[PDB]
RNA sequence: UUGUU
């Protein structure tokens, strides 16, 4: 597939980029290798992990299948751990998720889904409830794209007041 | 009791 950066743990601290390139190139072409370093004192030191960026997702997956939880590098007591790097995380859920406040306590998950369905696909909708299943009068709504969440906010924030509520509905990005 | 899982 397209390029992807993988985080790799249980790499011996003595290994450099050269050693890592050699290992990974067995499975697919490597764009870049970067050993994570600690510069807190002299000299800089490997943190025992690296990033490897493969040109294709296919290569990354083949390396993962071959290595993750399978290959134990020299001196290690656990096998390589490999997964996509944090920097590759794209649609953080946290940035696509709305807090909906001041909704009626009678409001159902389905009620909220319907109210907000016109703005995009809703991947999740949860009413916050207390111990006795009573609504806390608020919800979380996750859209598939933040774009759809912004659209809902502009259209729905304080647009109406629901049954039993002291103020208009609150629609905003979740904390 | 405006309540952010």
**Taking the alpha carbons of A160, A163, A166, A171 in that order, is the dihedral positive or negative?**
negative
Experimental technique for the deposited model: X-ray
Nearest-5° Cα angle at A141, A136 to A146: 145
Domain segments of chain A as ranges = 1-89, 90-175
Task: Say whether A90-175 and A1-89 share the same fold.
Answer: yes
Q: Is any atom of nucleic acid chain B found less than 7 Å from the CB of residue A160?
A: no
Q: Which of residues 75-94 of A have CB within 7 Å of strand B?
A: 94
Q: Output the six-digit token pair for A59.
A: 């290569």
Beta strands in chain A (DSSP E): 4-9, 30-38, 45-54, 81-84, 97-101, 122-129, 135-143, 170-173
Rounded distance, CA A146 to CA A92, Å? 9
Nearest-5° Cα angle at A126, A117 to A87: 85
Q: Which nucleotide is nearest to A136 (CA to C1')?
A: B3
Rounded distance, CA A31 to CA A173, Å? 37
Indicate the resolution in Å: 1.9
Indicate the CATH number for domain A1-89. Answer: 3.30.70.330
Round to a whole number and report the distance in Å from the CA of A47 to the C1' of B3: 43
> Is the CATH code 3.30.70.330 the one for domain A90-175?
yes
């Amino acid at each position: 597939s397209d390029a992807i950066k993988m985080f790799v743990g249980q790499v011996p601290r003595t290994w450099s980029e050269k050693d890592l390139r050699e290992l990974f190139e067995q499975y697919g072409a490597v764009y870049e290798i970067n050993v994570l370093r600690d510069r807190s004192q002299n000299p800089p030191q490997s943190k025992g992990c690296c990033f490897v960026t493969f040109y294709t997702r296919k290569a990354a997956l083949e390396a993962q299948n071959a290595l993750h939880n399978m290959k134990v590098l020299p001196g290690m007591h656990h096998p390589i751990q490999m997964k996509p790097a944090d920097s590759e995380k794209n649609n953080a859920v946290e940035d696509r998720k709305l807090f909906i406040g001041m909704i009626s306590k009678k409001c159902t998950e389905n009620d909220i889904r319907v109210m907000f369905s016109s703005f995009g696909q809703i991947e999740e909708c949860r009413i916050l409830r207390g111990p006795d299943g009573l609504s806390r009068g608020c919800a979380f709504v996750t859209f598939t794209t933040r774009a759809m969440a912004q659209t809902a906010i502009k259209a729905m924030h304080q647009a109406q007041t629901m049954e039993g509520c002291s103020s208009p509905m609150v629609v905003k990005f979740a904390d």
